[PDB]
């Protein structure tokens with residue numbers, strides 16, 4: 363579908379003693395790529411959607427990920443994000459992460475399908491909402 | 503199978519603007535719970551296994567997670583980890599994360615199945631190895 | 643002054659390729675130790691103080707830190723926090739971080755003096771407030 | 783002195799419940815800016831210096847920081863780093879962090895002076911070394 367791309371440089375601190383990117387760092391980047399996608403497609407930042415419509419963001423409900431090869435500091439990641447499927451109150455966001463060998467080869471580092479929802483905070487309780495029509499059209 | 507339990511207190515900084523735990527923090531805890539399991543079952547720390555046998559740790563290759571309810575600063579998480587299945591060069595580590603209502607009810611926060619492998623660093627190249635027999639027996 | 647102590651276990655992911663704790667992790671722990679101090683001294687969590695009195699927390703305004711020796715995964719940190727001085731709208735929180743050799747020797751890892759303030763969010767603008775008298779008495 | 787500039791976009795996950803950047807995130811960026819400076823001045827990555835000369839990186843020994851105004855997700859940071867003073871086995875790296883109002887005004891967010899050293903790992907023991915002459919000339 364409608365795909366957005368973003369780059370992310372791996373820093374020394376993003377790596378573990380094993381010398382490679384420590385996994386939960388991938389989830390930080392995927393979360394940034396997730397929101398970037400929305401931004402880039404025109405939605406306002408949560409700061410604003412929360413004022414205007416109660417939308418605090420798009421919390422994750424499910425994830426399937428696979429880590430194909432390692433990455434390390436200085437490698438520069440290219441992330442590809444698109445919405446793979448709209449559902450009632452959820453949506454599947456797909457991300458492909460790769461890096462580029464100096465051979466100009468594009469190695470797949472990781473991939474992940476995130477199931478998220480648009481949510482509101484009903485006081486202390488988080489609540490999912492019907493995907494907003496406006497949102498679907500924007501991201502379309 | 504053989505299950506280990508660990509607690510984790512959520513800090514203010516572990517939360518996002520939405521007031522709840524920011525997801526990639528769960529992966530940090532799951533990674534700590536993963537190693538804790540091994541430690542608690544008797545294996546030496548990677549620092550040592552890398553010297554003795556080249557084993558740098560247990561990198562993740564795949565993950566399936568589901569986020570059932572929200573959690574926030576001050577909540578105290580209880581994580582349950584066990585190895586669900588041994589395979590040839592991989593293993594499935596299962597984690598269940600919950601928190602306790604003051605009603606003494608144990609709410610499930612999240613769950614996740616991690617597919618990991620024992621690996622070595624062959625110079626700059628990460629390589630999986632056959633699950634060590636000794637390891638299986640220890641964790642058994 | 644009134645001192646609170648807390649322990650913190652270093653995880654593999656808290657370390658960098660150099661094999662030691664990556665510094666910004668110390669600041670996460672100091673921030674947890676900062677709030678823990680307040681909690682432990684009786685104040686309500688920010689979640690509540692923000693409702694009751696607008697107090698969103700105690701943002702940092704200044705810091706002086708020194709890193710005395712290294713620490714790594716599995717080391718267990720003991721943090722000592724106290725308020726070194728109350729000022730008008732600020733306060734100096736001091737932390738001492740150490741670890742224990744197996745010789746039972748208590749090595750100093752790091753130390754840091756944090757200057758923080760009680761703050762409110764006046765809409766999008768963060769604002770410091772006069773240290774609350776009640777707070778001084780509680781922490782005293 | 784010789785100054786390098788870098789940009790850093792603040793992500794939603796870099797913020798706390800208070801809606802602003804959680805401080806230890808500044809230290810991650812300063813650490814990236816620190817190494818970026820060296821890279822940009824021509825030194826090889828630690829991965830390589832450790833092979834060639836044992837240099838594992840530039841651990842921090844001391845820091846003085848001041849947080850002038852708040853920053854939040856979507857703000858884009860501009861970091862300015864330079865070496866303020868060479869010493870025997872240490873060096874003072876200075877960073878200035880700012881953001882740009884839409885008025886085109888450049889607000890100072892934070893500043894920090896980091897005292898670091900070039901270090902080697904003598905087995906499990908970290909050791910500082912005399913600033914390498916070559917390094918001084920490169921960064922000069």
Ligand SMILES: CC(C)(COP(=O)(O)OP(=O)(O)OC[C@H]1O[C@@H](n2cnc3c(N)ncnc32)[C@H](O)[C@@H]1OP(=O)(O)O)[C@@H](O)C(=O)NCCC(=O)NCCSCc1ccc(O)cc1
Pocket residue numbers: 393397408418419420421422423424449450451452477478479481488489490491518520522523524525568569570571572573794
């Ligand atoms: C999100 C929430 C409140 C939704 O529960 P709910 O309001 O009762 O509504 P619901 O059960 O119908 O779920 C909404 C939709 O998501 C779908 N969904 C929910 N769980 C799953 C799952 N495990 N797998 C697939 N789809 C799912 C539901 O089927 C439903 O579907 P529909 O299209 O058929 O209508 C509940 O799942 C929850 O709290 N999960 C925990 C969320 C969380 O804490 N994730 C970790 C932090 S994410 C941080 C973050 C926040 C904002 C951002 O901008 C980015 C990151």
Ligand SMILES: CC(C)(COP(=O)(O)OP(=O)(O)OC[C@H]1O[C@@H](n2cnc3c(N)ncnc32)[C@H](O)[C@@H]1OP(=O)(O)O)[C@@H](O)C(=O)NCCC(=O)NCCSCc1ccc(O)cc1
Pocket residue numbers: 378380382383384385428429430431432433533537548558559560561562563564589590591592617618619621628629630631654
């Ligand atoms: C791990 C490595 C090198 C293995 O590739 P390989 O050496 O060619 O061997 P391999 O393909 O046979 O895989 C080994 C086993 O894992 C299984 N496996 C590998 N990928 C998957 C997958 N996507 N789903 C399920 N099982 C998988 C393989 O089937 C194989 O199975 P077997 O039992 O049937 O023999 C390759 O998958 C890789 O580099 N993945 C990237 C790993 C990574 O960077 N994860 C992110 C960082 S994790 C940080 C960390 C490090 C140490 C720790 O202690 C903790 C955290």
Ligand SMILES: CC(C)(COP(=O)(O)OP(=O)(O)OC[C@H]1O[C@@H](n2cnc3c(N)ncnc32)[C@H](O)[C@@H]1OP(=O)(O)O)[C@@H](O)C(=O)NCCC(=O)NCCSCc1ccc(O)cc1
Pocket residue numbers: 514673677688698699700701702703704729730731732757758759761768769770771798800802803804805848849850851852853
């Ligand atoms: C905090 C705030 C709004 C205060 O500015 P203000 O409202 O105009 O008031 P102010 O200038 O009088 O400062 C209040 C007091 O702090 C003292 N102070 C402020 N800056 C400094 C400094 N650099 N060195 C020493 N003391 C300082 C001031 O002198 C003043 O003192 P006083 O006792 O003599 O009355 C302004 O400094 C600021 O925004 N700094 C940025 C704060 C920030 O973003 N830090 C990074 C994130 S911390 C995340 C966090 C949040 C909540 C938590 O529970 C924990 C962590």
Ligand SMILES: CC(C)(COP(=O)(O)OP(=O)(O)OC[C@H]1O[C@@H](n2cnc3c(N)ncnc32)[C@H](O)[C@@H]1OP(=O)(O)O)[C@@H](O)C(=O)NCCC(=O)NCCSCc1ccc(O)cc1
Pocket residue numbers: 374658660662663664665708709710711712713813817828838839840841842843844869870871872897898899901908909910911
């Ligand atoms: C770094 C090390 C081993 C140096 O101790 P040492 O080998 O006995 O040598 P030393 O005492 O002469 O210190 C070397 C120079 O730094 C200066 N220095 C050391 N401590 C301080 C301090 N508190 N304030 C100012 N300068 C200092 C020393 O005076 C000395 O100066 P010199 O120019 O007059 O000769 C010891 O301070 C230490 O382990 N500190 C802990 C370091 C640490 O764990 N920081 C947290 C993690 S940083 C992670 C990181 C790693 C690599 C990177 O690329 C980036 C981040």
